[PDB]
Amino acid sequence: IEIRFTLTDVVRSGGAPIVEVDDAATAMRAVLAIAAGVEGPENLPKVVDNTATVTVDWDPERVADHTGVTATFGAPLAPTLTVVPDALVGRCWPAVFAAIGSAATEAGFPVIEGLLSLVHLDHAARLLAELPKEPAEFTVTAKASAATDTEVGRVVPVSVEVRNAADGALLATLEERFAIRGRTGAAELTDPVRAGGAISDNATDTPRRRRRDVTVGAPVDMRPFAVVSGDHNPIHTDRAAALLAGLEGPIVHGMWLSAAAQHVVTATDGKPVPPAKLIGWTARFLGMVKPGDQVDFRVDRVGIDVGAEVLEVSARIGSELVMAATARLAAPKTVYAF
């Protein structure tokens, strides 16, 4: 697939010998549209209008590939579940991206977005008290809660609802917030301001408890995760696009890391029984990660929400902070006798 651009030269202004076509933004979109969707998925919402994901089925081999893509052993970790809540992101990905531009973006924004300048801020999965299972089919709905601009750029929080097809109920809620860095707007204004929390009705407070010291390698190439997740962004694959965006290299998918640190919290504090235990997880990406990376994670036990332990995770490659993560985990199941 090809990407074309156009220039125009007026030399009356010597300091501005080159001025290039204003159709760039719209021209960039048509290029991404061909590659991304290939008109394969089709629904035609405006950004406010709901984005629907038709139908989704989870094969046992899609369970294996993901659990095999991110693995932990040396720390006595045993992943168990039909569908890890991390697997939600693979289903909702192609729909979320469609909301990144629109007429509402045309009204209040210049509609100037470099896709290479796209930055993932936060990702979280909130459960409706239902957990994902075997062969039952899923159908997902994506909505943009707000379209915001910041001092550092344009931000689009996206809400996602995952539903079981056969049963016809909403299982989980997925939250994503993306950052394009060039834009301003009258739609939603933020300077430094954004906030999110995992909250529960009944709570207990605890003291800091060191649980595990984790060692996690980054994959050699980012293409394996790109295939499964459905993220084809050339930043993580092509070196020419990564260098053009002014990056340290073919940056590891933040989404892979998200499932990487999670799988540990899944198995460690979660113990040989993760499946009914973690009812939610949140992930903040502090810094960029190159492939072939030895990263050290540390999960601690902080406090209690709704009878579920909260677990805080910090990430370091050498001195650099990488991921800030926090999870709600049920305790190891208790049997009482009087």
């Binding site: 190891p332 199941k333 049997v335 006798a337």
Partner: peptide, 16 residues
């Protein structure tokens, strides 16, 4: 998978 067995009633807890 992992189970936790808790006995309650204070000093009666060590027995069962």
């Amino acid at each position: 998978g992992v189970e936790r067995f808790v006995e309650i009633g204070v000093k009666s807890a060590p027995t069962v």
